[PDB]
Write a protein that binds this DNA or RNA. Structure first.
Ligand SMILES: Nc1ncnc2c1ncn2[C@H]1C[C@H](O)[C@@H](COP(=O)(O)O)O1
Ligand SMILES: Nc1ncnc2c1ncn2[C@H]1C[C@H](O)[C@@H](COP(=O)(O)O)O1
Ligand SMILES: Nc1ncnc2c1ncn2[C@H]1C[C@H](O)[C@@H](COP(=O)(O)O)O1
Ligand SMILES: Nc1ncnc2c1ncn2[C@H]1C[C@H](O)[C@@H](COP(=O)(O)O)O1
Ligand SMILES: [Ca+2]
Ligand SMILES: [Ca+2]
Ligand SMILES: [Ca+2]
Ligand SMILES: [Ca+2]
Ligand SMILES: [Ca+2]
Lengths: 549, 49
DNA sequence: ACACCAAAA
DNA sequence: ATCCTCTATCAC
DNA sequence: ACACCAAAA
DNA sequence: ATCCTCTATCAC
DNA sequence: ACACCAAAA
DNA sequence: ATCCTCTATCAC
DNA sequence: ACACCAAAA
DNA sequence: ATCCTCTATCAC
């Protein structure tokens, strides 16, 4: 009944072209996964308190307090661009398309391999013998109804290999439980004590304990078996593949010229601000690009390092990414910093556990904010403001030298319109579930695609308990034959895009590579070494200029 | 803005033997969940390894 | 329960 | 004998 | 007035 | 002889 | 890909 | 043989 | 063996 | 289950 493959390797990508320039991209992912016995035979409600760090006065923003539930099951997440497309392709799509959208996903497991190891040769030295058990089995299940909490692997760089010819493994399934942690505020050395840094116990009203076994239909897989998913259909909104620029200052009718340049050097002039036509919502009897009326507000002011806290403890508030601006205000316009590692980039020949990191600066210009120049004038507008007639990014709030209006000012509002972030090539997350909150969020910074209806059930896997001749239930803690396994996973991801139209004149930014240089875009980066090592560097999504008005 | 029950509605007279009855209004509304939540920004998804 | 507000409910 | 300020869920 | 923007307007 | 950056309210 | 979450998917 | 916490995209 | 490479293989 | 760099001797 065995000795015959149950599936087929294929990690291709097809571009099906249709009329009106629509395109049906098809992602093919095949991967070899390894898996060994889950140490805990059961479910463990474990706790984590880093008093070693929480105790310091300034430290809190380093708080790791929580209590997870460790399941003996392992997750199989493929929700990460890096797993489906090939570097070059992402280039192609981005350099050529105008929009992209998720269509359907199809998963498949096969060619199960189960083996047990017997450490023998005690009569000579210390060897290890490998051989497979046929009767042994693996276990699969899919939380299609999504009873279990969502656990995105990119939420930890623990998704699957971005390199096909190299194997990979699964992240173990773990989920949060209810506690109610609490921590007090302190700075550098201050005085007194940390008044109380408590954790807490399980609350009757919010205790939620699930079990793969009481929630899903588990399927047994021996060597000759094989498993396959249904075919999930994505109900999502497409993502544009173009950055913008125009800011409140460049929206529509540029002022009228009265003076025309003489040579390619000197510039031109407008009409007297006093004696100029237009409209404004300030009382002054003149006009200036600065005070002129615009359609709405592009981008907005966000509060810096707004660590807020609830029964859970403290945490930094998330925030809509945006251009960093000349002001190089990163933490100010939510750029993101990733810390991937060798199955997801890294070089490969990089030494030490030190993970490689990358900060992503959003490309939706005209939406960014430069803290420095941001200022609030007063009342009745005055040509040149007094002193106590304008608060700037110098004046301190609540008696702190470096804390300014910026770090607490929130520009958001009705006329505040912006742009949806972009996806990051390798390392980036693809789709995500929606919060079951009667009132939803205009988007997640976590990922590009958010499912409007139900979402892809998570795929769980676990090896089966291979017992010994000895067994007592009431028995303290007991033996089980060593065992581990492998299997291939095959995924199908279909997308839809359309070709961009060329209308400018002046060519336009394209993602390209460069000769052996010190350039960010240097072929060599996406090339093997003499021993065969390579890295995957994030790439620009939305190389081409859009238009917003 | 000054209104008057008498210039706006159709008033019906009811003596002892009379009786009055409404139409049948249909609610066009959104349902209300009957469960509280807990999870906060600190417990959303992948717990650390 | 149309009959979802300004049209063709 | 309830339908968005009339008659008129009249707009069915 | 379809023709509501990314599909099957 | 106007439909969301082409042709092409082409998607009717 | 209906099957858009609370009904008449 | 994935549909919003069951069976059950069961609501087609 | 059409199926000869850029169309109407 | 081989057709000119994909799917697709798909162009039959
Ligand atoms: N659209 C339309 N045209 C004519 N008569 C209507 C219409 N809709 C309801 N009715 C009738 C039905 C009742 O006789 C009355 C209610 O007001 O009007
Ligand atoms: N969907 C679709 N297919 C084919 N021809 C179309 C379609 N819609 C409009 N038209 C025709 C009608 C006019 O002859 C022309 C306008 O462009 O295209
Ligand atoms: N609405 C409804 N009524 C009865 N049976 C249904 C319905 N929808 C799907 N099904 C059937 C189709 C399959 O036999 C099964 C799937 O669950 O139920
Ligand atoms: N010209 C053309 N149109 C459509 N389908 C085709 C054509 N030539 C071959 N085929 C079919 C025959 C097989 O089903 C498949 C092979 O690819 O495509
Ligand atoms: Ca269900
Ligand atoms: Ca009435
Ligand atoms: Ca036209
Ligand atoms: Ca089912
Ligand atoms: Ca072929």
């Amino acid at each position: 009944g065995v000795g015959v493959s149950t599936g087929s390797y294929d990690n291709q990508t097809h571009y099906r072209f249709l009329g009106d320039g629509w395109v049906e991209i098809t992602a093919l992912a095949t991967r070899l996964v390894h898996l060994n016995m889950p140490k805990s035979e059961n479910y463990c409600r474990i706790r984590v308190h880093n008093t070693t760090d929480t105790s310091v006065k300034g430290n809190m923003a380093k708080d790791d307090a929580h209590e997870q539930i460790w399941t003996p099951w392992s997750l199989v997440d493929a929700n990460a661009w890096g797993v489906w497309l090939q570097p070059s392709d992402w280039q192609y799509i981005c350099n050529t398309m105008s929009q992209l959208n998720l269509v359907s996903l199809d998963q498949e497991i096969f060619n199960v391999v189960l083996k047990t190891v017997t450490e023998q040769d005690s009569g000579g030295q210390a060897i290890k013998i490998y051989n497979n058990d046929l009767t042994a089995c693996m276990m699969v299940a899919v939380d299609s109804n999504n009873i279990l909490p969502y656990t995105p692997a990119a939420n930890s760089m623990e998704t699957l290999g971005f390199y096909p010819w190299k194997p990979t493994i699964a992240s173990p399934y773990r989920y949060y439980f209810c506690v109610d942690r609490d921590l007090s505020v302190t700075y550098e050395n201050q005085e007194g004590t940390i008044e109380h840094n408590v954790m807490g116990t399980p609350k009757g009203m919010n205790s939620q304990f699930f079990t793969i076994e009481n929630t899903q239909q588990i399927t047994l897989l021996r060597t000759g078996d094989e498993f396959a998913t249904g075919t999930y259909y994505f109900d999502t909104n497409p993502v544009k593949l173009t950055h913008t620029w125009q800011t409140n200052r460049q929206l529509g009718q540029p002022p009228l010229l009265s003076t025309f340049p003489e040579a390619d050097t000197d510039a031109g002039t407008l009409t007297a601000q006093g004696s100029r036509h237009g409209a404004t919502q300030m009382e002054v009897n003149w006009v200036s690009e600065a005070i002129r009326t615009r359609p709405a507000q592009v981008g907005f002011c966000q509060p810096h390092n707004d660590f807020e806290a609830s029964r859970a403890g403290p945490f930094a508030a998330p925030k809509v990414p945006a251009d960093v601006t000349q002001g190089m205000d990163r933490e100010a316009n939510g750029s993101v910093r990733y810390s991937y590692g060798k199955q997801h980039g890294e070089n490969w020949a990089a030494h030490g556990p030190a993970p490689e990191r990358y900060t992503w600066d959003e490309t939706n210009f005209g939406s960014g904010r430069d803290t420095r120049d941001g200022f609030i004038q007063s009342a009745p507008l005055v040509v040149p403001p007094p002193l106590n007639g304008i608060l700037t990014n110098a004046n301190p709030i609540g008696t702190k030298n470096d804390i300014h209006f910026s770090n607490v000012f929130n520009s958001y509002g009705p006329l505040t319109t912006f742009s949806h972030p972009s996806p990051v090539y390798p390392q980036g997350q693809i789709w995500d579930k929606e919060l079951d909150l009667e009132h939803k969020p205009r988007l997640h910074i976590t990922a590009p695609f958010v499912c409007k209806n139900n979402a892809p059930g998570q795929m769980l896997v676990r090896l089966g308990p291979n017992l010994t001749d000895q067994y007592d239930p009431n028995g303290a803690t007991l033996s089980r034959i060593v065992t581990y396994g492998t299997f291939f996973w095959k995924g199908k991801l279909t997308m839809r895009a359309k070709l961009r139209a060329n209308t400018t004149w002046n060519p336009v930014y394209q993602v390209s590579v460069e000769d052996n240089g010190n350039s960010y875009m240097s072929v060599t980066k996406w090339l093997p070494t003499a021993t065969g090592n390579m890295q995957s560097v994030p790439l620009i999504t939305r190389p081409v200029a859009r238009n917003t008005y």
